[PDB]
């Protein structure tokens, strides 16, 4: 069928999504807006090949991203203007192959192996798994944090944080949630554990915010014994990026760190199809893990020797969240 | 702007084009049509991971390729039925990562390096350049030839082949054009040169067609001295996949092989934007070369010590062709 074939071919297009990411990485639209509109001028500005750049811009013009106001000279359309570095959509940074999201999206090249094995393929491409790479590379981690900002009031209200004297945030970088908890709970002291590079950036952030007397930052690995005990151990959007066997290892380390009467608190994603499926596929291919159902959290808790003693949610940012309270059996 | 942002994000989608290729490679829709419709049944049939397959099919359902008639059981939509192996669109084979086109399309992962260097990136990924890989791998070469079939009457009529006693087809696999020329020219004998693996497949084809007394097949490299002299040396859709420096090397070998009075004959692509640009981008990234203008062919001929003594075209299959006659100066 002609309509079906044309639809499938449009849906199969790898050239345009790659062309957009290369253009973003080259700051192509910024150069065009500055008057470097020929392939030769763009080659001088970027270091790339003039003939190949001409062919790239021909393609982006055919896709409606650019126009050709003079022979051999390109300029952004209204659509292409979204790739300007200062555009409020930040689409240039979402697509930039030298920032964390564009870099990670290239791992979809390895989708066949992700589907064969069920394992993420970012480490296969880059030599370190995703969170470790962003920790060890200040530029990558900071770029991810900047994009993902675009007040933690709901989780601060959803739990009585004034009853917790010592709080340990496991995988807590960049420290926004723990900072909000402690500003609402004067009697609480915090410890934040994350990988060493991410922890160092968080330590600098906390000091610049005047919270270094309220929060100790520790660089380390949450698959290892945790560095302190605590009355509440917080896992905020951490377990969702791990398999059930790995999440059980993390929960075990957290349960071992509980003081008498202590609790583990999960802040997690709550349990249109296309948007949610793209997020799920990013989890399969490079972020790790999956979004669990309420039943799956109960099963995970039981396998960790934990009772679910409370759930508060949905907490309503495009996605909703849930706060879970877990206690040792 | 909301409309622009939504358009750019749709255009940026790498998940769906990769999901389609993985599904094609797994023969997923064929398995569903055979009743293996759960992730567990599909894992048994394919060897892939059941949980990852479930997430793949969720995505393809969200994209309109599949539906979920029973909980946990998927089936193709009318769109998805195009991925059945026996569908006349052959879209499963166009997308199959174990056939030549899907395998090559993954090289668009390396578009950044193609744009930086101007060089194709297939050899970087697979260890051999495209035509060499298809020559050395009978399955890949045969899959490409089968897809690209979907009578050579125009080029046979466009030149007086009855005046050529000895014809050499340089890069002539799979041999269709030379076979058509010789069936129209009783006084002509042919020699066909291609890489050894492609030449062996062509030799078998020619023998099965009863043309082995009319055509000698030689395995070799057209950057080397050619194996025979000839009255007409034919380059049919060969020079377009090479840079000007490489095309000049090939033209030099061809000019050296001309008998007195001999001619070189080019059958080439003639000089909607989106379709042609995708073809151009495939040339940049893995096929090699570019489509030249009439002016560029004249410049190439002059740099090779050749006069253009005739052009016959356009010859009208979606694309048009041109026949060029070249003579030593
Ligand atoms: N093995 C490990 N040990 C400690 N932290 C880890 C880790 N693997 C991943 N992480 C950290 O897990 C965090 C997940 S994203 C940050 C979640 C944060 N608690 C929030 O609410 O937003 C990252 O900061 C990452 O560096
Ligand atoms: N170095 C080389 N030496 C000989 N043949 C080569 C070669 N590099 C590529 N080729 C061959 O060039 C051909 C280009 S496609 C085949 C073109 C054919 N003449 C036609 O009309 O359809 C392929 O068969 C490929 O194997």
Residue numbers in the entry:
A (entry chain D), B (entry chain D): 22 to 171, 176 to 296, 305 to 349, 353 to 365
What does the paper behind this entry write?
The specificity of EamK and related 10-decarboxylase TamK lies between DnrK and RdmB, since anthracycline aglycones and monoglycosylated compounds are accepted as substrates. TamK has been shown to catalyze 10-decarboxylation of 4 and 5, but not 6 (29). The SAM binding site is highly conserved in the enzyme family with the exception of the 10-decarboxylases that contain two mutations G189A/K190P. The structure of the binary complex of wild-type TamK and SAM confirmed the interactions between the co-substrate and R4 in 10-decarboxylases. The overall fold of TamK remains very similar to that of the other members of the family with modest root-mean-square deviations to DnrK (3.7 Å) and to RdmB (3.8 Å). However, the distinct proline-alanine pair in R4 alters the conformation of the Cα main chain in the region and leads to a movement of 2.1 Å in comparison to DnrK. This change coincides with a 1.8 Å change in SAM positioning, which is the most likely reason behind the lack of methylation activity in TamK. Two-point mutations G189A/K190P in R4 are sufficient for misalignment of SAM and loss-of-methylation activity.
